[PDB]
Amino acid sequence: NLYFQGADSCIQFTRHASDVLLNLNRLRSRDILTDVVIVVSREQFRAHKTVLMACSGLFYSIFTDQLKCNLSVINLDPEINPEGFCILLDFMYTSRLNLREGNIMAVMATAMYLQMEHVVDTCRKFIKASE
Amino acid sequence: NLYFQGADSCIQFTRHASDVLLNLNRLRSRDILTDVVIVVSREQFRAHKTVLMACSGLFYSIFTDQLKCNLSVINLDPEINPEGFCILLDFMYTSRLNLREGNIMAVMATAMYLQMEHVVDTCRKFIKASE
Ligand SMILES: C[C@@H]1CN(c2ncc(Cl)c(Nc3ccc4c(c3)n(CCC(C)(C)O)c(=O)n4C)n2)C[C@H](C)C1(F)F
Ligand SMILES: C[C@@H]1CN(c2ncc(Cl)c(Nc3ccc4c(c3)n(CCC(C)(C)O)c(=O)n4C)n2)C[C@H](C)C1(F)F
């Protein structure tokens, strides 16, 4: 079944949120209604400001600032690893985090900078397992 | 736990999609980065085009049209019931559909017009239960 009786009066749809996220990622792949470019070193990543704000404390602060909310280009710290950013951007649109031994440190440092608490805590737990 | 091993290599976060949707609804309540007004009769509803496109076949068609994608105001058919639209807009941002005996017909007619198949099918199943 696609739905159930929630704790409240409303009928709740089980796959709705993941279906919305899937469709937002489809818009991203097709470059539909993307309204910002995130520049990390040489690399450029097109995205939707609302998705970035929904996932990152840093992007929330940037796009709620009256001066910066209108910027079409956002440059991150040039010390940010582009692959780490790419993995986190993918995560934002999919719920899947491609953590590997070779990228975990860059992913963690990027999540810290982006203020993505859950990802930071997760990276920390995986690092602790290896020691 | 916040995460699990998905069918693929990636670590998947269980609540990520619903957390993104919750944050998108918070942006809507605060009128943050809303980029469209949907006019239904007298009523006005501010929203995010990408959320509308992710949930509705009609909004997908409107905002992928080269001429209409830039419109800041969208007028729906004046025969659309504002309460039915409100319930569906709430559903888009929350996954909860407030269906009641008094609104089910308007909600169904609105979902048909908006091309929200899952909601139409659901309304049809609930109507069938009463007969
Ligand atoms: C009043 C306002 C409500 N908040 C909020 N609203 C909307 C968004 Cl887009 C949003 N996005 C957002 C902001 C910060 C985040 C954030 C999202 N995430 C990601 C959380 C999820 C569950 C998406 O992984 C995260 O780790 N941090 C630190 N947050 C939290 C903020 C602190 C607030 F209190 F100021
Ligand atoms: C190539 C492109 C991919 N599609 C798609 N991509 C992105 C979005 Cl925003 C999106 N949104 C969208 C469009 C139509 C919808 C639609 C969303 N929904 C809602 C589906 C969910 C699961 C969100 O309830 C629905 O019932 N209908 C009919 N769909 C389906 C369309 C038909 C397509 F094939 F042309």
Q: Domain limits of chain A?
A: 1-131
CA angle B123, B95, A91 (to 5 degrees): 140
Is residue B54 a contact partner of residue B20, using CB atoms and an 8 Å limit? Answer: no
In this complex, do B118 and A48 lie within 8 Å of one another by their Cβ atoms? Answer: no
Task: Please give the structure tokens belonging to residue B131.
Answer: 């007969």
Q: Superfamily assignment of B1-131 in CATH?
A: Potassium Channel Kv1.1; Chain A (3.30.710.10)
> Phi and psi of B76, rounded to 5°?
-90, 170
- Whole-angstrom distance, CA of residue A22 vs CA of residue B21: 12
Task: Report how far residue B80's alpha carbon sits from residue B108's, in angstroms, rounded to the nearest whole number.
Answer: 11
CA B12 to each of CA A48, A65, B1, B25, B127: distance values in angstroms, whole numbers, following the listed order: 21, 31, 11, 23, 37
Q: Please give the sequence-ordered ranges of beta strands (E in DSSP) within B3-126, or none if there are none.
A: 3-5, 11-13, 36-40, 43-47, 73-75, 96-97
State the DSSP code for B33. S
> Nearest-CA residue of chain B relative to A70?
B33
Nearest to B99 among A11, A91, A122 (CB): A11
**B96 contacts A6? CB cut-off 8 A:** yes
Residues linked to residue A36 through DSSP beta bridges, in sequence order: A47
Q: How was this structure determined?
A: X-ray
Q: How far apart are CA B26 and CA B23, in angstroms?
A: 5
Amino acid symbol at B58? L
Q: What is the resolution of this structure in A?
A: 1.9
- Are A41 and A78 in contact by the 8 Å Cβ rule? The answer is yes
Distance to chain A for B118, nearest Cα, Å: 8
Sign of CA dihedral A30, A68, A39, A55: negative
Which helix H or strand E contains A13, and what residues bound it? Answer: strand A11-13
Give every CB contact of residue B18 below 8 A, 6+ residues apart in sequence.
A17, B95
Indicate the burial class of B77 (C-beta count within 10 angstroms; 0-12, 13-18, 19 or more). Answer: exposed
Residue nearest to atom 19 of ligand 2 (CA): B55
Tell me the Cα Rg of chain A: 17
